[PDB]
Design a protein around this nucleic acid. Structure first.
Lengths: 97, 95, 75, 83, 97, 83
DNA sequence: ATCCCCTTGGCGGTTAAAACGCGGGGGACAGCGCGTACGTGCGTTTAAGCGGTGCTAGAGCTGTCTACGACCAATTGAGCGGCCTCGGCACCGGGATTCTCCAGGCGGCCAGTG
DNA sequence: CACTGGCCGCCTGGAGAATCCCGGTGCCGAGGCCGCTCAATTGGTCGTAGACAGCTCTAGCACCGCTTAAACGC
């Protein structure tokens, strides 16, 4: 029998390893393509620093980390280990959007 | 050449060697510390401005910024900063 | 050792006889009053509930499976 | 020339790592699309502020300086790139 | 027998009556006593303008009613209509205090 | 001159009426005392800030302007008293 | 008006990024009652609300004065730019420990029986 | 009704593997050295804002007499 771990244990291993991780968690190039995509939705033929791609990358991931730690607080308040979209929606509502 | 682009690298390095002579510093951490210096400095400067105009004071003195520190800095961090700044200004007025 | 716990379940559900079924709260506190380790025997009372519902001596009032509330059968 | 979908380039496994940072242990399938949606909303607000800076700078290339300025205005001040 | 409404509809009558009303629900005199007491806990012999007491009264009014509408959001999150103080602790945490 | 127990000055029916304005139907019994406590800590912040404003002014009476000003620097600005 | 540099544009190799299917397996959730706990209906009380009275603390304005601090020319010096070496660490190779999940026993318990 | 037997659910044990845990290496950012120049300071000046006495008056504070609304309670 090939060895298999129970669900959540690999998830919790990912939790521990990536709270331990400090690097950027997103592929760089599609994020660059996406910020350029939203840029030409606003102004034409617009250019970016690579440092600006880094900055939006790290700000975006940290902001999402804020939304998801609020999501765990909401979900354990909702007595769920499986989150739903309404957790994130309520977090956006309370955060002062 | 290039124009001199200003940063707080040397003085944080000085206090670093002052309080931990054996430790090192990285470039990312130094950028974080420069952003920290800028952030706390601008918060205190903004609150000092608000105290200046609420009392219609044309100047921000040690009383103004001291009060602003009690507003911004919480609790024991605030009173320790008051102690440090009071010791510093007494040493400054002692020339 | 002693007698099996299913007899305790039957006497606990026959002691009350509400017009509606008895849920698990009153059953587990009836076993607590009679004397039973209800905290450590959740699986044992679950298999007891499955045995008594499945064999047909007892009828479920309105719930489904071990969920819900239970009453006595017609005879 | 133009691009029509790079929102999905912030992929489903990438969103999974991001929520692994937040401590989220089980994620249903319905969360991910709304996360990219609110990602679009936030980054749309930030880049609106940023291009408004940038057009006010009378330049055509975005720097990280106006990025951290816009993050300051929105209230999520970023350390590391100031100055 | 005297007439008696079911538990809840008198509460909803109070609800509807009070968003149609504007009146400050906190009694003036014990609020002034409380603000003098809390101020005396810090700095002594401290006097309050009546305008200050009133202004702080709608301030505290709005702060708590914002907290209660937020905890109602937390309660309908929790499939509940009766809020419990962990809703308030949640709201304090995810608002960021 | 000294006061001891003004946390109970904000009465239980006052708390119930507060939660009526916030749209709360049912209010459990544990709510009243800890809501007194969180009102207490909110006023500790607000009054400490405002009284700090007053002692900055070398005034001795707390004014409504300082209450709304200490509100506003906490991101809680109030309309209707000179702000 | 320019200049020069980091982004833009284009190119080749690769392996992790992803990605989708299988399958186990962890999960939300209605619901049926039960415990109970405020919600609401009254009565009671008492203190907040209202009205009136005397005091004065300090809020706030005015005058005085002086304590204090930007500006500026100048001198200089210590940190910014720039280059340059070097070992802590970035990456690499081999071994324990968690850990954890899985294999075989212990025990409770249900089920049959003299 | 006690005695005995067998199977589900925990009890006990144990081995593979991810990540930590012992060295090995080479390197490039980090610590350090040098030119300098832009900026840190110094003294004098000007000029100005605010700290403080006085004062005054006014609104806040101290006190009292009813009255059911509100608080308290069951």
């Amino acid at each position: 029998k090939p060895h298999r771990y129970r669900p959540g244990t690999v998830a919790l291993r990912e939790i521990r390893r990536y709270q331990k991780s400090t690097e950027l968690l997103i592929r760089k190039l599609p994020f660059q393509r996406l910020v350029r995509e939203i840029a030409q939705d606003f102004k034409t033929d617009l250019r970016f620093q690579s440092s600006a791609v880094m900055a939006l990358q790290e700000a975006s991931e940290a902001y999402l980390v804020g939304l998801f730690e609020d999501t765990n607080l909401a979900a354990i308040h909702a007595k769920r280990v499986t989150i739903m979209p309404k957790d994130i929606q309520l977090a956006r509502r309370i955060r002062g959007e | 050449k290039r124009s001199r682009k200003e940063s707080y690298s040397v003085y944080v390095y000085k206090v670093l060697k002052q309080v931990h002579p054996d430790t090192g510093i990285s470039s990312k951490a130094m950028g974080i510390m420069n952003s920290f210096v800028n952030d706390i400095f601008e918060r205190i400067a903004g609150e000092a401005s608000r105290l200046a105009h609420y009392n219609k004071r044309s100047t921000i003195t040690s009383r103004e910024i001291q009060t602003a520190v009690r507003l911004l800095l919480p609790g024991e961090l605030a009173k320790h900063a008051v102690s440090e700044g009071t010791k510093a200004v007494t040493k400054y007025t002692s020339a | 050792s002693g007698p099996p716990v299913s007899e305790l379940i039957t006497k606990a559900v026959a002691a009350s006889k509400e017009r509606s079924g008895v849920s698990l709260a009153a059953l587990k506190k009836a076993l607590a009053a009679a004397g039973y380790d209800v905290e450590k025997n959740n699986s044992r009372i679950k298999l007891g509930l499955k045995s008594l519902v499945s064999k047909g001596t007892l009828v479920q009032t309105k719930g489904t499976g071990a969920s819900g509330s239970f009453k006595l059968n017609k005879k | 020339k133009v691009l029509r979908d790079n929102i999905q380039g912030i992929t489903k496994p990438a969103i999974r790592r991001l929520a692994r940072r937040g401590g989220v242990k089980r994620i249903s399938g319905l969360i991910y699309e709304e996360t990219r949606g609110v990602l679009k909303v936030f980054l749309e607000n930030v880049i609106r502020d940023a291009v408004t800076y940038t057009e006010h700078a009378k330049r055509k290339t975005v720097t990280a300086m106006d990025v951290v300025y816009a993050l300051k205005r929105q209230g999520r001040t970023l350390y590391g790139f100031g100055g």
